[PDB]
Amino acid sequence: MRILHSMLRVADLEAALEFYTRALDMRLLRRRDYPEGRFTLAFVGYQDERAAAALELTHNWDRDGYTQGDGYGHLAIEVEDAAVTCARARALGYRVTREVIAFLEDPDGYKVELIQKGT
Amino acid sequence: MRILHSMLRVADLEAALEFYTRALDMRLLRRRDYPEGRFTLAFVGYQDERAAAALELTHNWDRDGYTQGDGYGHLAIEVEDAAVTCARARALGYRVTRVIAFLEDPDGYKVELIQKG
Ligand SMILES: [Zn+2]
Ligand SMILES: [Zn+2]
């Protein structure tokens, strides 16, 4: 058995993909529209889904935002240098909650934990 | 770069660990109390954290339950036989909601089972 992915609902799919690709160097693994269900999915990550865990992003066409709650914690990502990742995210105008570990917020306010490689 | 883990806050850490270890065959990778912060965390998964993504579970000592929103979706797990894992989860008393299936953990977090493939 293996963990395949976490799924997060996003108010704006392209806004979410722009963050994961620019701030986090992720690649779009697959993307599909479901008019029958009025939703779109995008899988993003680093390796192909057959090799590693990915992040699934869902946008429901009939929604403009979601209730977050305080149950969901964060997504942790291993990075080469947390300070460079942080500085780049701030340069792109993204919220850096705390700044070797650091925390980013995606456009929907989901927290991303940056864990510098070799910790 | 790689995804290390998702983190979820649980009302009862023992109840969460019984689900993840017995219904989903996960190994308890590590567990640590932090008296200074009045919380405990546990890491669960299949491979060691250096090789694959894990799941982090947190319990805050001063909390009895968490506000669950509709933003967080689910955690998907690859299984050898979805109908077998499903039936075992049911045999342990866990709910199986509406080859892919959906389980609910003790806090109501959804687990998507995807048969390998
Ligand atoms: Zn974490
Ligand atoms: Zn999924």
PDB file of all heavy atoms in Angstrom, chain A residues 1-2 4-7 9 24 56 63 67 69-71 73-74 76 78 110 113, chain B residues 1-2 4-7 9 24 46 63 67 69-71 73-74 76 78 109 112:
ATOM      1  N   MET A   1       0.812  -1.205   0.000  1.00  0.00           N
ATOM      2  CA  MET A   1       0.000   0.000   0.000  1.00  0.00           C
ATOM      3  C   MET A   1       0.852   1.265   0.000  1.00  0.00           C
ATOM      4  O   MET A   1       1.961   1.260   0.507  1.00  0.00           O
ATOM      5  CB  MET A   1      -0.916   0.021   1.224  1.00  0.00           C
ATOM      6  CG  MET A   1      -2.135  -0.852   1.073  1.00  0.00           C
ATOM      7  SD  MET A   1      -2.935  -1.103   2.655  1.00  0.00           S
ATOM      8  CE  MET A   1      -4.098   0.128   2.629  1.00  0.00           C
ATOM      9  N   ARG A   2       0.316   2.362  -0.527  1.00  0.00           N
ATOM     10  CA  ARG A   2       1.032   3.637  -0.493  1.00  0.00           C
ATOM     11  C   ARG A   2       0.078   4.811  -0.506  1.00  0.00           C
ATOM     12  O   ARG A   2      -1.039   4.704  -1.030  1.00  0.00           O
ATOM     13  CB  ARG A   2       2.060   3.758  -1.633  1.00  0.00           C
ATOM     14  CG  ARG A   2       1.459   3.790  -2.992  1.00  0.00           C
ATOM     15  CD  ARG A   2       2.528   3.803  -4.050  1.00  0.00           C
ATOM     16  NE  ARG A   2       1.866   3.765  -5.342  1.00  0.00           N
ATOM     17  CZ  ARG A   2       1.758   4.796  -6.158  1.00  0.00           C
ATOM     18  NH1 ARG A   2       2.337   5.952  -5.858  1.00  0.00           N
ATOM     19  NH2 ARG A   2       1.088   4.679  -7.291  1.00  0.00           N
ATOM     20  N   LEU A   4      -1.313   7.984  -2.092  1.00  0.00           N
ATOM     21  CA  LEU A   4      -1.346   8.492  -3.460  1.00  0.00           C
ATOM     22  C   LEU A   4      -1.410   9.980  -3.515  1.00  0.00           C
ATOM     23  O   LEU A   4      -0.673  10.584  -4.297  1.00  0.00           O
ATOM     24  CB  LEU A   4      -2.564   7.934  -4.219  1.00  0.00           C
ATOM     25  CG  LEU A   4      -2.543   6.439  -4.471  1.00  0.00           C
ATOM     26  CD1 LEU A   4      -3.855   5.996  -5.088  1.00  0.00           C
ATOM     27  CD2 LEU A   4      -1.347   6.034  -5.343  1.00  0.00           C
ATOM     28  N   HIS A   5      -2.339  10.584  -2.733  1.00  0.00           N
ATOM     29  CA  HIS A   5      -2.524  12.039  -2.751  1.00  0.00           C
ATOM     30  C   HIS A   5      -3.468  12.508  -1.644  1.00  0.00           C
ATOM     31  O   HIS A   5      -4.214  11.710  -1.096  1.00  0.00           O
ATOM     32  CB  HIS A   5      -3.063  12.519  -4.153  1.00  0.00           C
ATOM     33  CG  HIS A   5      -4.409  11.967  -4.545  1.00  0.00           C
ATOM     34  ND1 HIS A   5      -4.530  10.856  -5.388  1.00  0.00           N
ATOM     35  CD2 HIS A   5      -5.654  12.362  -4.170  1.00  0.00           C
ATOM     36  CE1 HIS A   5      -5.843  10.651  -5.538  1.00  0.00           C
ATOM     37  NE2 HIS A   5      -6.563  11.527  -4.828  1.00  0.00           N
ATOM     38  N   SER A   6      -3.438  13.833  -1.343  1.00  0.00           N
ATOM     39  CA  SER A   6      -4.375  14.549  -0.500  1.00  0.00           C
ATOM     40  C   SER A   6      -5.199  15.325  -1.507  1.00  0.00           C
ATOM     41  O   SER A   6      -4.663  15.692  -2.549  1.00  0.00           O
ATOM     42  CB  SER A   6      -3.618  15.525   0.392  1.00  0.00           C
ATOM     43  OG  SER A   6      -4.507  16.384   1.078  1.00  0.00           O
ATOM     44  N   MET A   7      -6.458  15.632  -1.195  1.00  0.00           N
ATOM     45  CA  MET A   7      -7.283  16.441  -2.084  1.00  0.00           C
ATOM     46  C   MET A   7      -7.783  17.688  -1.324  1.00  0.00           C
ATOM     47  O   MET A   7      -8.255  17.569  -0.199  1.00  0.00           O
ATOM     48  CB  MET A   7      -8.459  15.650  -2.691  1.00  0.00           C
ATOM     49  CG  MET A   7      -9.264  16.464  -3.730  1.00  0.00           C
ATOM     50  SD  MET A   7     -10.471  17.662  -3.057  1.00  0.00           S
ATOM     51  CE  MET A   7     -11.997  16.653  -3.059  1.00  0.00           C
ATOM     52  N   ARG A   9     -10.056  21.422  -1.964  1.00  0.00           N
ATOM     53  CA  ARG A   9     -10.966  22.180  -2.837  1.00  0.00           C
ATOM     54  C   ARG A   9     -10.457  23.641  -2.892  1.00  0.00           C
ATOM     55  O   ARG A   9     -10.067  24.225  -1.871  1.00  0.00           O
ATOM     56  CB  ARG A   9     -12.418  22.118  -2.354  1.00  0.00           C
ATOM     57  CG  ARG A   9     -12.972  20.679  -2.337  1.00  0.00           C
ATOM     58  CD  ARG A   9     -14.476  20.584  -2.111  1.00  0.00           C
ATOM     59  NE  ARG A   9     -14.906  19.187  -2.172  1.00  0.00           N
ATOM     60  CZ  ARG A   9     -14.913  18.356  -1.138  1.00  0.00           C
ATOM     61  NH1 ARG A   9     -14.595  18.789   0.076  1.00  0.00           N
ATOM     62  NH2 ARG A   9     -15.229  17.082  -1.308  1.00  0.00           N
ATOM     63  N   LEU A  24       6.145  26.666  -5.876  1.00  0.00           N
ATOM     64  CA  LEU A  24       6.557  25.344  -5.420  1.00  0.00           C
ATOM     65  C   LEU A  24       7.161  24.388  -6.456  1.00  0.00           C
ATOM     66  O   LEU A  24       7.501  23.265  -6.097  1.00  0.00           O
ATOM     67  CB  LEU A  24       5.423  24.669  -4.602  1.00  0.00           C
ATOM     68  CG  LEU A  24       5.098  25.326  -3.233  1.00  0.00           C
ATOM     69  CD1 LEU A  24       3.849  24.696  -2.597  1.00  0.00           C
ATOM     70  CD2 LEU A  24       6.268  25.203  -2.271  1.00  0.00           C
ATOM     71  N   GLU A  56      -4.085  16.667  -5.170  1.00  0.00           N
ATOM     72  CA  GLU A  56      -5.236  16.812  -6.042  1.00  0.00           C
ATOM     73  C   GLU A  56      -5.955  18.103  -5.713  1.00  0.00           C
ATOM     74  O   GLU A  56      -6.307  18.371  -4.568  1.00  0.00           O
ATOM     75  CB  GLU A  56      -6.189  15.622  -5.852  1.00  0.00           C
ATOM     76  CG  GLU A  56      -7.437  15.680  -6.740  1.00  0.00           C
ATOM     77  CD  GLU A  56      -8.420  14.539  -6.476  1.00  0.00           C
ATOM     78  OE1 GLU A  56      -8.225  13.794  -5.490  1.00  0.00           O
ATOM     79  OE2 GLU A  56      -9.356  14.357  -7.286  1.00  0.00           O
ATOM     80  N   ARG A  63     -19.289  26.878  -6.815  1.00  0.00           N
ATOM     81  CA  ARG A  63     -18.743  27.425  -5.560  1.00  0.00           C
ATOM     82  C   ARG A  63     -17.719  28.515  -5.857  1.00  0.00           C
ATOM     83  O   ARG A  63     -17.066  28.451  -6.898  1.00  0.00           O
ATOM     84  CB  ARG A  63     -18.091  26.321  -4.683  1.00  0.00           C
ATOM     85  CG  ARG A  63     -18.992  25.158  -4.285  1.00  0.00           C
ATOM     86  CD  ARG A  63     -19.976  25.479  -3.171  1.00  0.00           C
ATOM     87  NE  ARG A  63     -19.312  25.945  -1.947  1.00  0.00           N
ATOM     88  CZ  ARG A  63     -18.957  25.153  -0.940  1.00  0.00           C
ATOM     89  NH1 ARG A  63     -19.186  23.847  -1.000  1.00  0.00           N
ATOM     90  NH2 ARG A  63     -18.369  25.660   0.134  1.00  0.00           N
ATOM     91  N   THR A  67     -15.257  26.663   3.363  1.00  0.00           N
ATOM     92  CA  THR A  67     -15.054  26.759   4.813  1.00  0.00           C
ATOM     93  C   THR A  67     -13.854  25.861   5.131  1.00  0.00           C
ATOM     94  O   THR A  67     -13.873  24.679   4.796  1.00  0.00           O
ATOM     95  CB  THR A  67     -16.321  26.293   5.548  1.00  0.00           C
ATOM     96  OG1 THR A  67     -17.452  26.963   5.000  1.00  0.00           O
ATOM     97  CG2 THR A  67     -16.253  26.541   7.053  1.00  0.00           C
ATOM     98  N   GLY A  69     -12.193  25.268   8.398  1.00  0.00           N
ATOM     99  CA  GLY A  69     -12.231  24.564   9.677  1.00  0.00           C
ATOM    100  C   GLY A  69     -10.853  24.558  10.318  1.00  0.00           C
ATOM    101  O   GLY A  69      -9.925  25.181   9.794  1.00  0.00           O
ATOM    102  N   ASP A  70     -10.679  23.853  11.438  1.00  0.00           N
ATOM    103  CA  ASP A  70      -9.351  23.822  12.045  1.00  0.00           C
ATOM    104  C   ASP A  70      -8.851  22.411  12.201  1.00  0.00           C
ATOM    105  O   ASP A  70      -7.924  22.184  12.964  1.00  0.00           O
ATOM    106  CB  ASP A  70      -9.312  24.602  13.381  1.00  0.00           C
ATOM    107  CG  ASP A  70     -10.281  24.115  14.439  1.00  0.00           C
ATOM    108  OD1 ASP A  70     -10.968  23.098  14.196  1.00  0.00           O
ATOM    109  OD2 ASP A  70     -10.338  24.740  15.524  1.00  0.00           O
ATOM    110  N   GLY A  71      -9.501  21.466  11.519  1.00  0.00           N
ATOM    111  CA  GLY A  71      -9.095  20.064  11.548  1.00  0.00           C
ATOM    112  C   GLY A  71      -7.907  19.843  10.621  1.00  0.00           C
ATOM    113  O   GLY A  71      -6.882  19.275  11.023  1.00  0.00           O
ATOM    114  N   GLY A  73      -4.574  20.368   8.844  1.00  0.00           N
ATOM    115  CA  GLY A  73      -3.343  21.008   9.288  1.00  0.00           C
ATOM    116  C   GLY A  73      -2.592  21.708   8.177  1.00  0.00           C
ATOM    117  O   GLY A  73      -2.700  22.928   8.015  1.00  0.00           O
ATOM    118  N   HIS A  74      -1.810  20.939   7.408  1.00  0.00           N
ATOM    119  CA  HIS A  74      -0.952  21.491   6.361  1.00  0.00           C
ATOM    120  C   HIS A  74      -0.439  20.364   5.465  1.00  0.00           C
ATOM    121  O   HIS A  74      -0.701  19.181   5.733  1.00  0.00           O
ATOM    122  CB  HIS A  74       0.257  22.213   7.032  1.00  0.00           C
ATOM    123  CG  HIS A  74       1.061  21.364   7.979  1.00  0.00           C
ATOM    124  ND1 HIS A  74       0.918  21.481   9.353  1.00  0.00           N
ATOM    125  CD2 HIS A  74       2.022  20.446   7.724  1.00  0.00           C
ATOM    126  CE1 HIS A  74       1.750  20.604   9.884  1.00  0.00           C
ATOM    127  NE2 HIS A  74       2.449  19.966   8.948  1.00  0.00           N
ATOM    128  N   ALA A  76       3.268  19.128   3.939  1.00  0.00           N
ATOM    129  CA  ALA A  76       4.714  19.348   4.117  1.00  0.00           C
ATOM    130  C   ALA A  76       5.450  18.945   2.870  1.00  0.00           C
ATOM    131  O   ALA A  76       5.201  17.873   2.303  1.00  0.00           O
ATOM    132  CB  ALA A  76       5.232  18.561   5.298  1.00  0.00           C
ATOM    133  N   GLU A  78       9.457  18.788   1.087  1.00  0.00           N
ATOM    134  CA  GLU A  78      10.919  18.848   1.246  1.00  0.00           C
ATOM    135  C   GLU A  78      11.483  19.785   0.169  1.00  0.00           C
ATOM    136  O   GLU A  78      11.187  19.604  -1.011  1.00  0.00           O
ATOM    137  CB  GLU A  78      11.522  17.446   1.114  1.00  0.00           C
ATOM    138  CG  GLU A  78      13.001  17.359   1.476  1.00  0.00           C
ATOM    139  CD  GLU A  78      13.500  15.929   1.567  1.00  0.00           C
ATOM    140  OE1 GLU A  78      13.676  15.295   0.503  1.00  0.00           O
ATOM    141  OE2 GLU A  78      13.670  15.425   2.701  1.00  0.00           O
ATOM    142  N   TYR A 110      -4.521  27.562   2.470  1.00  0.00           N
ATOM    143  CA  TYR A 110      -4.028  26.271   2.948  1.00  0.00           C
ATOM    144  C   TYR A 110      -2.557  26.426   3.238  1.00  0.00           C
ATOM    145  O   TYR A 110      -1.821  27.001   2.437  1.00  0.00           O
ATOM    146  CB  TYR A 110      -4.204  25.168   1.928  1.00  0.00           C
ATOM    147  CG  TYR A 110      -5.654  24.849   1.634  1.00  0.00           C
ATOM    148  CD1 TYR A 110      -6.188  25.066   0.371  1.00  0.00           C
ATOM    149  CD2 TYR A 110      -6.477  24.279   2.607  1.00  0.00           C
ATOM    150  CE1 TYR A 110      -7.498  24.725   0.077  1.00  0.00           C
ATOM    151  CE2 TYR A 110      -7.793  23.920   2.317  1.00  0.00           C
ATOM    152  CZ  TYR A 110      -8.302  24.165   1.052  1.00  0.00           C
ATOM    153  OH  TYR A 110      -9.578  23.801   0.726  1.00  0.00           O
ATOM    154  N   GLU A 113       4.036  23.561   4.710  1.00  0.00           N
ATOM    155  CA  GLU A 113       5.205  23.478   5.564  1.00  0.00           C
ATOM    156  C   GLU A 113       6.452  23.162   4.734  1.00  0.00           C
ATOM    157  O   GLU A 113       6.537  22.097   4.140  1.00  0.00           O
ATOM    158  CB  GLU A 113       4.970  22.390   6.625  1.00  0.00           C
ATOM    159  CG  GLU A 113       6.020  22.345   7.736  1.00  0.00           C
ATOM    160  CD  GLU A 113       5.925  21.205   8.737  1.00  0.00           C
ATOM    161  OE1 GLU A 113       5.415  20.116   8.391  1.00  0.00           O
ATOM    162  OE2 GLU A 113       6.409  21.396   9.874  1.00  0.00           O
TER     163      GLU A 113
ATOM    164  N   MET B   1      12.525  18.008  -5.188  1.00  0.00           N
ATOM    165  CA  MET B   1      11.562  18.258  -4.100  1.00  0.00           C
ATOM    166  C   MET B   1      10.585  17.104  -4.013  1.00  0.00           C
ATOM    167  O   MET B   1      10.409  16.378  -4.995  1.00  0.00           O
ATOM    168  CB  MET B   1      10.787  19.548  -4.364  1.00  0.00           C
ATOM    169  CG  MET B   1      11.666  20.764  -4.357  1.00  0.00           C
ATOM    170  SD  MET B   1      10.894  22.205  -5.089  1.00  0.00           S
ATOM    171  CE  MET B   1       9.743  22.661  -3.857  1.00  0.00           C
ATOM    172  N   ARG B   2       9.948  16.931  -2.844  1.00  0.00           N
ATOM    173  CA  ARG B   2       8.972  15.858  -2.667  1.00  0.00           C
ATOM    174  C   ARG B   2       7.948  16.189  -1.567  1.00  0.00           C
ATOM    175  O   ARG B   2       8.237  16.966  -0.653  1.00  0.00           O
ATOM    176  CB  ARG B   2       9.676  14.508  -2.387  1.00  0.00           C
ATOM    177  CG  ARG B   2      10.539  14.527  -1.145  1.00  0.00           C
ATOM    178  CD  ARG B   2      11.121  13.180  -0.840  1.00  0.00           C
ATOM    179  NE  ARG B   2      11.845  13.209   0.431  1.00  0.00           N
ATOM    180  CZ  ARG B   2      11.571  12.431   1.473  1.00  0.00           C
ATOM    181  NH1 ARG B   2      10.539  11.601   1.436  1.00  0.00           N
ATOM    182  NH2 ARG B   2      12.283  12.530   2.584  1.00  0.00           N
ATOM    183  N   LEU B   4       6.192  15.375   1.727  1.00  0.00           N
ATOM    184  CA  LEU B   4       6.558  14.621   2.913  1.00  0.00           C
ATOM    185  C   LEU B   4       5.323  14.075   3.625  1.00  0.00           C
ATOM    186  O   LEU B   4       5.282  12.898   3.947  1.00  0.00           O
ATOM    187  CB  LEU B   4       7.402  15.480   3.875  1.00  0.00           C
ATOM    188  CG  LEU B   4       8.789  15.920   3.345  1.00  0.00           C
ATOM    189  CD1 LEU B   4       9.385  17.011   4.215  1.00  0.00           C
ATOM    190  CD2 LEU B   4       9.734  14.742   3.225  1.00  0.00           C
ATOM    191  N   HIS B   5       4.310  14.920   3.874  1.00  0.00           N
ATOM    192  CA  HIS B   5       3.126  14.460   4.599  1.00  0.00           C
ATOM    193  C   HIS B   5       2.021  15.470   4.587  1.00  0.00           C
ATOM    194  O   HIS B   5       2.296  16.657   4.371  1.00  0.00           O
ATOM    195  CB  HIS B   5       3.495  14.183   6.087  1.00  0.00           C
ATOM    196  CG  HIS B   5       4.084  15.346   6.842  1.00  0.00           C
ATOM    197  ND1 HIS B   5       5.448  15.464   7.036  1.00  0.00           N
ATOM    198  CD2 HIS B   5       3.467  16.354   7.512  1.00  0.00           C
ATOM    199  CE1 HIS B   5       5.612  16.512   7.831  1.00  0.00           C
ATOM    200  NE2 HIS B   5       4.459  17.090   8.130  1.00  0.00           N
ATOM    201  N   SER B   6       0.770  15.025   4.861  1.00  0.00           N
ATOM    202  CA  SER B   6      -0.328  15.955   5.160  1.00  0.00           C
ATOM    203  C   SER B   6      -0.436  15.892   6.666  1.00  0.00           C
ATOM    204  O   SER B   6      -0.111  14.857   7.257  1.00  0.00           O
ATOM    205  CB  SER B   6      -1.660  15.469   4.583  1.00  0.00           C
ATOM    206  OG  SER B   6      -1.648  15.342   3.173  1.00  0.00           O
ATOM    207  N   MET B   7      -1.044  16.902   7.288  1.00  0.00           N
ATOM    208  CA  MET B   7      -1.264  16.847   8.736  1.00  0.00           C
ATOM    209  C   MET B   7      -2.723  17.120   9.008  1.00  0.00           C
ATOM    210  O   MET B   7      -3.278  18.065   8.429  1.00  0.00           O
ATOM    211  CB  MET B   7      -0.398  17.863   9.482  1.00  0.00           C
ATOM    212  CG  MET B   7      -0.481  17.679  11.022  1.00  0.00           C
ATOM    213  SD  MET B   7      -1.921  18.488  11.780  1.00  0.00           S
ATOM    214  CE  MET B   7      -1.171  20.068  12.192  1.00  0.00           C
ATOM    215  N   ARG B   9      -5.643  17.195  12.410  1.00  0.00           N
ATOM    216  CA  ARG B   9      -5.878  17.265  13.864  1.00  0.00           C
ATOM    217  C   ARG B   9      -7.034  16.319  14.237  1.00  0.00           C
ATOM    218  O   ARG B   9      -8.058  16.264  13.558  1.00  0.00           O
ATOM    219  CB  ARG B   9      -6.156  18.686  14.317  1.00  0.00           C
ATOM    220  CG  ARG B   9      -5.007  19.627  13.999  1.00  0.00           C
ATOM    221  CD  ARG B   9      -5.171  20.934  14.765  1.00  0.00           C
ATOM    222  NE  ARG B   9      -4.095  21.867  14.437  1.00  0.00           N
ATOM    223  CZ  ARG B   9      -4.068  22.635  13.352  1.00  0.00           C
ATOM    224  NH1 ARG B   9      -5.085  22.627  12.498  1.00  0.00           N
ATOM    225  NH2 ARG B   9      -3.026  23.411  13.110  1.00  0.00           N
ATOM    226  N   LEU B  24      -6.166   0.398   7.885  1.00  0.00           N
ATOM    227  CA  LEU B  24      -5.389   0.754   6.712  1.00  0.00           C
ATOM    228  C   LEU B  24      -3.978   0.157   6.681  1.00  0.00           C
ATOM    229  O   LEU B  24      -3.214   0.446   5.753  1.00  0.00           O
ATOM    230  CB  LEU B  24      -5.397   2.294   6.527  1.00  0.00           C
ATOM    231  CG  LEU B  24      -6.783   2.930   6.282  1.00  0.00           C
ATOM    232  CD1 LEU B  24      -6.675   4.415   6.179  1.00  0.00           C
ATOM    233  CD2 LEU B  24      -7.412   2.416   5.005  1.00  0.00           C
ATOM    234  N   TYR B  46       3.454   3.819   5.416  1.00  0.00           N
ATOM    235  CA  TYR B  46       3.835   2.501   4.915  1.00  0.00           C
ATOM    236  C   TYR B  46       5.341   2.375   4.797  1.00  0.00           C
ATOM    237  O   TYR B  46       5.895   1.398   5.282  1.00  0.00           O
ATOM    238  CB  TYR B  46       3.120   2.226   3.592  1.00  0.00           C
ATOM    239  CG  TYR B  46       1.611   2.327   3.729  1.00  0.00           C
ATOM    240  CD1 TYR B  46       0.915   3.422   3.217  1.00  0.00           C
ATOM    241  CD2 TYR B  46       0.887   1.351   4.408  1.00  0.00           C
ATOM    242  CE1 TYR B  46      -0.467   3.521   3.339  1.00  0.00           C
ATOM    243  CE2 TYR B  46      -0.495   1.448   4.551  1.00  0.00           C
ATOM    244  CZ  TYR B  46      -1.168   2.532   4.011  1.00  0.00           C
ATOM    245  OH  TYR B  46      -2.528   2.620   4.141  1.00  0.00           O
ATOM    246  N   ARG B  63      -8.191  20.396  23.530  1.00  0.00           N
ATOM    247  CA  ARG B  63      -9.299  20.284  22.551  1.00  0.00           C
ATOM    248  C   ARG B  63     -10.016  18.936  22.660  1.00  0.00           C
ATOM    249  O   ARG B  63      -9.365  17.925  22.917  1.00  0.00           O
ATOM    250  CB  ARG B  63      -8.786  20.466  21.095  1.00  0.00           C
ATOM    251  CG  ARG B  63      -8.194  21.846  20.749  1.00  0.00           C
ATOM    252  CD  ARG B  63      -9.175  23.015  20.725  1.00  0.00           C
ATOM    253  NE  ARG B  63     -10.258  22.850  19.749  1.00  0.00           N
ATOM    254  CZ  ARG B  63     -10.237  23.351  18.517  1.00  0.00           C
ATOM    255  NH1 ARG B  63      -9.181  24.033  18.085  1.00  0.00           N
ATOM    256  NH2 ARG B  63     -11.267  23.170  17.704  1.00  0.00           N
ATOM    257  N   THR B  67     -13.274  21.793  14.225  1.00  0.00           N
ATOM    258  CA  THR B  67     -14.256  22.302  13.277  1.00  0.00           C
ATOM    259  C   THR B  67     -13.876  21.753  11.924  1.00  0.00           C
ATOM    260  O   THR B  67     -12.767  21.984  11.443  1.00  0.00           O
ATOM    261  CB  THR B  67     -14.347  23.841  13.307  1.00  0.00           C
ATOM    262  OG1 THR B  67     -14.597  24.271  14.643  1.00  0.00           O
ATOM    263  CG2 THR B  67     -15.459  24.378  12.413  1.00  0.00           C
ATOM    264  N   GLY B  69     -14.399  21.773   8.046  1.00  0.00           N
ATOM    265  CA  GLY B  69     -14.921  22.572   6.949  1.00  0.00           C
ATOM    266  C   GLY B  69     -15.186  21.719   5.731  1.00  0.00           C
ATOM    267  O   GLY B  69     -15.284  20.496   5.831  1.00  0.00           O
ATOM    268  N   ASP B  70     -15.325  22.351   4.573  1.00  0.00           N
ATOM    269  CA  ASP B  70     -15.569  21.614   3.337  1.00  0.00           C
ATOM    270  C   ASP B  70     -14.477  21.849   2.306  1.00  0.00           C
ATOM    271  O   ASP B  70     -14.636  21.473   1.138  1.00  0.00           O
ATOM    272  CB  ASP B  70     -16.984  21.896   2.775  1.00  0.00           C
ATOM    273  CG  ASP B  70     -17.325  23.352   2.528  1.00  0.00           C
ATOM    274  OD1 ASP B  70     -16.397  24.190   2.507  1.00  0.00           O
ATOM    275  OD2 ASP B  70     -18.519  23.650   2.313  1.00  0.00           O
ATOM    276  N   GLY B  71     -13.360  22.431   2.745  1.00  0.00           N
ATOM    277  CA  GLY B  71     -12.229  22.679   1.868  1.00  0.00           C
ATOM    278  C   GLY B  71     -11.387  21.427   1.703  1.00  0.00           C
ATOM    279  O   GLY B  71     -11.093  20.999   0.575  1.00  0.00           O
ATOM    280  N   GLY B  73     -10.536  17.778   1.284  1.00  0.00           N
ATOM    281  CA  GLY B  73     -11.251  16.739   0.582  1.00  0.00           C
ATOM    282  C   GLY B  73     -11.067  15.382   1.201  1.00  0.00           C
ATOM    283  O   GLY B  73     -11.973  14.885   1.854  1.00  0.00           O
ATOM    284  N   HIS B  74      -9.925  14.731   0.910  1.00  0.00           N
ATOM    285  CA  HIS B  74      -9.651  13.363   1.349  1.00  0.00           C
ATOM    286  C   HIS B  74      -8.196  13.022   1.192  1.00  0.00           C
ATOM    287  O   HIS B  74      -7.424  13.804   0.642  1.00  0.00           O
ATOM    288  CB  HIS B  74     -10.497  12.366   0.542  1.00  0.00           C
ATOM    289  CG  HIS B  74     -10.299  12.454  -0.946  1.00  0.00           C
ATOM    290  ND1 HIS B  74     -11.218  13.082  -1.753  1.00  0.00           N
ATOM    291  CD2 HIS B  74      -9.279  12.007  -1.710  1.00  0.00           C
ATOM    292  CE1 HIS B  74     -10.730  12.998  -2.996  1.00  0.00           C
ATOM    293  NE2 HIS B  74      -9.567  12.367  -3.012  1.00  0.00           N
ATOM    294  N   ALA B  76      -6.051   9.785  -0.401  1.00  0.00           N
ATOM    295  CA  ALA B  76      -6.171   8.605  -1.258  1.00  0.00           C
ATOM    296  C   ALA B  76      -5.028   7.682  -0.968  1.00  0.00           C
ATOM    297  O   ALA B  76      -3.883   8.128  -0.739  1.00  0.00           O
ATOM    298  CB  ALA B  76      -6.160   9.000  -2.728  1.00  0.00           C
ATOM    299  N   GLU B  78      -3.397   3.743  -2.107  1.00  0.00           N
ATOM    300  CA  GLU B  78      -3.404   2.650  -3.089  1.00  0.00           C
ATOM    301  C   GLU B  78      -3.493   1.321  -2.324  1.00  0.00           C
ATOM    302  O   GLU B  78      -2.660   1.066  -1.449  1.00  0.00           O
ATOM    303  CB  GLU B  78      -2.117   2.669  -3.921  1.00  0.00           C
ATOM    304  CG  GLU B  78      -2.076   1.575  -4.970  1.00  0.00           C
ATOM    305  CD  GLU B  78      -0.890   1.725  -5.896  1.00  0.00           C
ATOM    306  OE1 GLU B  78       0.235   1.373  -5.482  1.00  0.00           O
ATOM    307  OE2 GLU B  78      -1.075   2.300  -6.989  1.00  0.00           O
ATOM    308  N   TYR B 109     -12.778  12.248   8.722  1.00  0.00           N
ATOM    309  CA  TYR B 109     -11.937  12.543   7.541  1.00  0.00           C
ATOM    310  C   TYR B 109     -12.103  11.448   6.516  1.00  0.00           C
ATOM    311  O   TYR B 109     -12.110  10.278   6.906  1.00  0.00           O
ATOM    312  CB  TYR B 109     -10.463  12.634   7.929  1.00  0.00           C
ATOM    313  CG  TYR B 109     -10.171  13.799   8.831  1.00  0.00           C
ATOM    314  CD1 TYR B 109      -9.620  13.605  10.092  1.00  0.00           C
ATOM    315  CD2 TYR B 109     -10.338  15.107   8.383  1.00  0.00           C
ATOM    316  CE1 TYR B 109      -9.304  14.684  10.918  1.00  0.00           C
ATOM    317  CE2 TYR B 109      -9.951  16.191   9.168  1.00  0.00           C
ATOM    318  CZ  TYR B 109      -9.493  15.974  10.458  1.00  0.00           C
ATOM    319  OH  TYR B 109      -9.160  17.041  11.245  1.00  0.00           O
ATOM    320  N   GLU B 112      -9.976   7.802   0.533  1.00  0.00           N
ATOM    321  CA  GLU B 112     -10.309   7.238  -0.783  1.00  0.00           C
ATOM    322  C   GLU B 112      -9.418   6.014  -1.039  1.00  0.00           C
ATOM    323  O   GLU B 112      -8.202   6.145  -0.970  1.00  0.00           O
ATOM    324  CB  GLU B 112     -10.060   8.313  -1.847  1.00  0.00           C
ATOM    325  CG  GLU B 112     -10.462   7.925  -3.259  1.00  0.00           C
ATOM    326  CD  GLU B 112     -10.132   8.957  -4.320  1.00  0.00           C
ATOM    327  OE1 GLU B 112      -9.067   9.620  -4.239  1.00  0.00           O
ATOM    328  OE2 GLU B 112     -10.885   8.997  -5.315  1.00  0.00           O
TER     329      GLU B 112
END
